Amino acid sequence: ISDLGLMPGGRVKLVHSALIQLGWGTTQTLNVKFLPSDPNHFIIGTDMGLISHGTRQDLRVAPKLFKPQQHGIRPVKVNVIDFSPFG
Amino acid sequence: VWDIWQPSGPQKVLICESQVTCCCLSPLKAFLLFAGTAHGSVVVWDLREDSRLHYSVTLFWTFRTATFSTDGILTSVNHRSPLQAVEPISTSVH
Amino acid sequence: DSRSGLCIEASSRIMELDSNDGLLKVHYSDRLVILLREVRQLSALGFVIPAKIQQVANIAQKFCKQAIILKQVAHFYNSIDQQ
């Protein structure tokens, strides 16, 4: 099964989990951004006002979360994530 | 699809059936173009393809439509959940 | 009153669209969007979520997922048609 062209498919699949620390109780994500330097690292932001860190290969390198010098929650609903294109 | 330095007029165009978002390009060369569908499926067009077997119009300009979406063979990777973002992961070291 | 009463699942149609164009007819598109926002905002704001809302919210997810795969099947068919 394919289109009537000469094109690849989607047989390969890998799945990774997220929101372990974050998770009614069911939470979601809003945005993801990977690290240009080592694309195996990435961060994910959620509506609850926090951003988590993780990677693909070694999933225990630094499983910390990012937070400003604030308290409580402040669900600022982060909507844009980027990376500084420098060293 | 168009370029900054080129004169007036799009260079190419891709088409789909449902709402398209979560779009990105190939970082090594213009081989594929990727996009996430609003309804959770994933599509990719073949960029490095000649113009043939596509509906053309006069005034010439020719359209291009070619992808096999995850709408076909059923699987779990779709997770039946809208997508938020896609990104090319340049980690192939195998 | 009107949105917990056995939400009717989405169904596709091809009889009214006898032009080789299958379409999914979602009935309660509002209920889904509302409940999704409902639980998300109540959680973020530190508000209590009544049992009634959590039951239907979990159900609403079921409807959303099923509606999407139905669209996928329709899209697959529609692709076949175009060929």
Swiss-Prot record, chain A:
Domain of life: Eukaryota
Tissue specificity as recorded in UniProt: Expressed in chondrocytes (at protein level).
Transmembrane segments: none
Location of this chain's protein in the cell: Cell projection, Cilium; Cytoplasm, Cytoskeleton, Microtubule organizing center, Centrosome
Purpose of the protein: Acts as one of several non-catalytic accessory components of the cytoplasmic dynein 2 complex (dynein-2 complex), a motor protein complex that drives the movement of cargos along microtubules within cilia and flagella in concert with the intraflagellar transport (IFT) system. DYNC2I1 plays a major role in retrograde ciliary protein trafficking in cilia and flagella. Also requires to maintain a functional transition zone.
Recorded family membership: Belongs to the dynein light intermediate chain family.
Subunit structure: Intermediate chain of the cytoplasmic dynein complex 2, a multisubunit complex, composed at least of eleven different proteins. The cytoplasmic dynein 2 complex consists of two catalytic heavy chains (HCs) and a number of non-catalytic subunits presented by intermediate chains (ICs), light intermediate chains (LICs) and light chains (LCs).
Clinical disorder: Short-rib thoracic dysplasia 8 with or without polydactyly: A form of short-rib thoracic dysplasia, a group of autosomal recessive ciliopathies that are characterized by a constricted thoracic cage, short ribs, shortened tubular bones, and a 'trident' appearance of the acetabular roof. Polydactyly is variably present. Non-skeletal involvement can include cleft lip/palate as well as anomalies of major organs such as the brain, eye, heart, kidneys, liver, pancreas, intestines, and genitalia.
Identification of the protein by name: Cytoplasmic dynein 2 intermediate chain 1
Source organism per UniProt: Homo sapiens (Human)
The gene coding this protein: DYNC2I1
